[PDB]
Amino acid sequence: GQKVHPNGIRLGIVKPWNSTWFANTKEFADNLDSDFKVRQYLTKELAKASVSRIVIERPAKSIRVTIHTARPGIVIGKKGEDVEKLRKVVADIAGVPAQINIAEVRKPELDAKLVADSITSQLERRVMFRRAMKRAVQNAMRLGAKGIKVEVSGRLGGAEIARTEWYREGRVPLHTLRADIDYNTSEAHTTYGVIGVKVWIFKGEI
Amino acid sequence: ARIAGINIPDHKHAVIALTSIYGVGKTRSKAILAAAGIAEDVKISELSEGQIDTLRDEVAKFVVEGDLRREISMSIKRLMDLGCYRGLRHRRGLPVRGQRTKTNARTRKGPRKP
Amino acid sequence: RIRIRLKAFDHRLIDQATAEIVETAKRTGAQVRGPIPLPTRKERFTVLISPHVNKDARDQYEIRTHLRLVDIVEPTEKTVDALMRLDLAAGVDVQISL
Amino acid sequence: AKQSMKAREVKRVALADKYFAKRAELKAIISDVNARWNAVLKLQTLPRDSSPSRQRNRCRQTGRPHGFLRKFGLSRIKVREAAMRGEIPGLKKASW
Amino acid sequence: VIGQRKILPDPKFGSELLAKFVNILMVDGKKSTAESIVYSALETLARPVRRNALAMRWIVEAARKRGDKSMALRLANELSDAA
Amino acid sequence: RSLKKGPFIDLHLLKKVEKAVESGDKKPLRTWSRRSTIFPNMIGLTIAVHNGRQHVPVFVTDEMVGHKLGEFAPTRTYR
Amino acid sequence: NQYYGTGRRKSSAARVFIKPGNGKIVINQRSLEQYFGRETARMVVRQPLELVDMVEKLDLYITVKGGGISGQAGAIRHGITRALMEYDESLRSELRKAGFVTRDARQVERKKVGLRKARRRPQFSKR
RNA sequence: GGCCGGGAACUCAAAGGAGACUGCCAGUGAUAAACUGGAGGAAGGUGGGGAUGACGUCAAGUCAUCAUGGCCCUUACGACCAGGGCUACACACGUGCUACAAUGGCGCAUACAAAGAGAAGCGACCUCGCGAGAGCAAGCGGACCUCAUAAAGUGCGUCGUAGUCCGGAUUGGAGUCUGCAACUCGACUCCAUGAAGUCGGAAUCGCUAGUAAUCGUGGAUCAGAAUGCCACGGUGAAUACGU
RNA sequence: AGAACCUUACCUGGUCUUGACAUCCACGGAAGUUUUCAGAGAUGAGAAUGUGCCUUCGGGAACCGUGAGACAGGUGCUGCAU
């Protein structure tokens, strides 16, 4: 490889942790494994809910999983029954009386995960990716983000040869550690090969 | 002047020199000297009869390297000559603990030999 | 003598947390010793970066365990219960001790 | 790292719990330094797949036996994805 | 270009013309041993970075396996022969 | 050898040998416990123990006091 | 009456208290001859007090902990200086020209990934 | 005995700031960039070391970490179990460690580290114990106890070139712990071996400061199993005419 | 970044074929606990206790064994398909 992951290197910088609990070595592995258990059956059950982040935190023997979604209505449901049923699936797969908080993700096409997911959604629907990848390229420009990069990976179009194309616009100073780079990836399970997508969102300095 | 026949030190200390026995080493060749009140600064040929004889009675009870590694022999023979796997290791220059014999078998198997 | 030991992963949560006890507890019956900063234990992990042969990479990680020893000194009837209802700073080990 | 290989860890962890806490914690005291018995020690022989030595200690994500880390419970490859994506609290890049 | 390293003068006498000598007869970071080597040889005998360095290195470099009581005092003899 | 007490044998022959020690000498009995040590009572017994390919009988002689049976069950047989 | 200067060098951390008269030096409740002296760590601690008027007019009190023999000796040397510029400012320039004022920042290199001694790459003799 | 009052000075601990900016001065340089030195300054010229790797380069590697397209076997290369493999040598070469010793080795008194870990855990004292150690069992989920006496270093004596007091392979008796179980194929020790190795061929590798070079320390993985890896410290060098 | 079994993907032998591992259909028995006997174990042949929460009376709530099927399973092969 060549590149560092922009989000994790800024973990001690403007990018905040999306898993904030303090636990000892004894429960650290169990809590971390419990985090993956609650997360794996939280994104899978909300694959069409525009989930941006799933932040986990354990104040006192009860985790409070807040979900960043651009469409809270599908996650909340009618009068919060969907959060309620998801809550008791988290509550018994995490061992704690968990509760699920919800947060609207304003300006959805400006989220790294959502852009990666949105492109991935309309990528296996048998459409040409040149226009599809520009849609995230174009949409971000009118709504700020004075810097962005949307890279796609191998098996671009029905072919036996892998390709790569990224089509930068704006400025993406990934070397600058206070760049506040929103970055996330996704992969598309197409009938041929696997196509991974990678997007960087430069939401201004600090 | 034969503590055990072979394996005699010469012109050195009491304890460290008398590790020259090849049936007793650093730890069990100092008590035998200490059993008669020996000085640590005596040269090997500088002792007297009083110390030599007081040890010959108490050292002849043990074995000699000439006898030790060949009283090891029948232990390797009376017990270890059969198809025993450790005795299989005792056959063609082969390590007995089983350490990597691919390389690093340059004492029993010995030199480089295709 | 009510030993208070806080523990977090960043100081920007423990510092807000440690100040909370030094303020909330110190109302009428607290002569709080102070937000005493103890040496922060930091442990490191050298995970092998590549999924395969490539070995020389060996990225390095670090987790820091900041701790304070606020340690209010009179166990006032208020303090022995005033310290109880506060449970903010979600990820923080607040170990109340005598 | 197989569903067949993974299934024998659950078979072994769930079975090593009982005889260790019911027989080994009681019988291995006799075989220790208590000053052993020929016929009595035969009871330890009868069960096989209940021992701490039966450990593989595989990863908790993909069942990979190699490159484990007991603090996280995962393997070399999974901790990189599970940490630097931000999903492990307090863990950042170590530079000094 | 850059100049050669500046070394503090030998503390024992406060003179710069002895520290460079004791640093090269030194071996394996054992300066403490070095005074046991040369001070016993010195306190009891009673461009400037090219030829002085090279010539004086030749003095030190012949005391490895000469086979005697101790080259610690043999080098004292060697410098006594040199002086 | 380091056990210094109760020289172990796996179950694979206590279910056969230690059940019919006094019956006599028979055809070698199937055994998967070469990780073992011979008790003196097995004089003259032939116990077929699995080296990995087949079950190799063991001829218990009195050269042994605490030596092993897999000591007499070689597996890396070359040439 | 005590004039204090800390001094510290290479993980060492000294505390030097200067008093007037009797020119005696006490390090870790011990004299410097038994604790540092007669190696190159005897003259080195007194280099600053000897270039300036000799010790007999300055009583010392030193409590140094951590580091090593040389690191503490350098730390104490720095400790005496900081104490004695607080004593008098007339000898401000004399020590800096002599060079005891500055505090050494040459730490030991951290051991790093891929190198055998963090600056000695592993042998790659043959290709 | 910081041991206790007590002091909050100081080290230290962890939070925040200030400080270094060719800032100033002299000179060179087009006056400039820039450079040369000096001053102050703790730090001088991005003060030091890390993290950070551009488009792309090798159809580089991984289908065996995982995911995955296609392909393949579905009373089966599927699966369980026991066993034994995986460590087998007759070698060719890396990478090392051990070293090959008289800046020394052995014996005694013997001071000064940092950094880490500890709950089926670090496990102290005491006793037994030649020891692997064993029995009892305080404390510690820890700036509170243990790991852990750091060696190197210092003082004295000694070993006097002896393939040796070095060196430890190899091999034996017994152990000591872990586990159903160690011989295959664990470690280490008590005792006992005690050889090969006295610097090695062209060649080549690393290194410009706390750096090479030593010596110890801890940690990961780990029932048990470091000459390997990672991290910590101590002692601590010499050189640079230039392309 | 750590091979006595397991480990380990290899093999010898024994064994199971909706399978050790997942879900679905049906039949039973609660599971669990104490057991023995043959085998090396996987298992098989038996012997005791239990039969627990609803029981809205079925059966669920769990699990185990069995029955046919879908299916499972693969450290199987292409890293020049990714």
From Swiss-Prot, chain E:
Miscellaneous section: The strain K12 sequence is shown.
Job description of the protein: One of the primary rRNA binding proteins, it binds directly to 16S rRNA where it nucleates assembly of the head domain of the 30S subunit. Is located at the subunit interface close to the decoding center, where it has been shown to contact mRNA. Has been shown to contact tRNA in both the P and E sites; it probably blocks exit of the E site tRNA.
Family per similarity comment: Belongs to the universal ribosomal protein uS7 family.
Assembly mode: Part of the 30S ribosomal subunit. Contacts proteins S9 and S11. Cross-links to IF3 and the P and E site tRNAs.
The protein's name in its UniProt record: Small ribosomal subunit protein uS7
Gene name as annotated: rpsG
